[model samples]
Target: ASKKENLLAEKVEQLMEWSSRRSIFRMNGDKFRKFIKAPPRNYSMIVMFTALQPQRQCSVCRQANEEYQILANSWRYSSAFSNKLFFSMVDYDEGTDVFQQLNMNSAPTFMHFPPKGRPKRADTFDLQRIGFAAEQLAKWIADRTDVHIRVFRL
Candidate 1:
């Protein structure tokens, strides 16, 4: 490759590294307050991950986080549902405002807010902390939204 081409390639690699640091879950850039205050107005699906301190010892929080990360990473730079679906996080420390606002005192939770104007009475798909898994989350989407989160046969 030419010098200019090599330089361009380097720049792209740097950009990806920077971008990867930012979670596709949309947590790093904005806090939970921002999301609760102004959720996506258009056709949207949001997955809110709430990991509190009580679950710290069991390390379920880390597991839950990994699920979100894997899902986001696997999506490959926002597939067809990029604009339509969003992933969010509400940590015990960071999302204090959201917790109080929502009257939440749970360890780890996952809530899915369906699309706008979709006209569904189902509120949040609240996943309890004790026995939560990625497969359950995926099934949550499959049962409701057209977006099948993941289908792992293994």
Candidate 2:
């Protein structure tokens, strides 16, 4: 039992390392369960549920993907970064089950998974209202999690 707890804690560190190495970690259904849904999580995650396949023809998803990548990269290099936050993307083609579980029919949906509680309506990004820009995302993250992100626009 104690060993199981240790492993859970170690899993968070493992995820942190993975997120750091990659600008944003790509997640599928199983990874979504283990990393975001599973308990014992000590960090917050901003997940982008998008369909990036060319055949799908989701232009907004592609634009949001670029902005999401910008936000992830900025967080990766932030001096304040301390494993408190992580970024991940779930492609619809790869994580179809995830979308179904979330009851998401949209091409580009952003959700914030907190360490303890289930995601609230406020956790979902308002693409129509706020727009999908890296700077706007940073502000939203700050408002939600108190983790101030500095977006490095290029």
| Top candidate when judged by lDDT against the true structure | 2
lDDT of 2 at 114: 95
Write the residue-wise lDDT of candidate 2 on 1-154 in tens digits. Answer: 6976887779877886787579788999999999999888878899999999998999999999999998889888874447778889999999999999989888898889999989988899889998999999888888889998888883
Q: After superposing candidate 2, which stretches have Cα over 4 Å from the reference?
A: 1-5, 79-81
Worst 10 residues of 1 by lDDT: 34-43
Q: After superposing candidate 1 on the true structure, give the runs of residues whose Cα lies further than 4 Å from its correct spot.
A: 1-23, 26-30, 52-58, 115-123, 126-130, 151-154
lDDT at residue 139 of model 1 (Cα atoms):
65
Q: lDDT of each structure?
A: 0.53, 0.87
- Tell me the deviation in Å of residue 142 in model 1: 2.8
Angstrom error at residue 138, model 2 = 0.6
**Candidate achieving the largest TM-score:** 2
| lDDT score at residue 26, model 1, on the 0-100 scale | 43
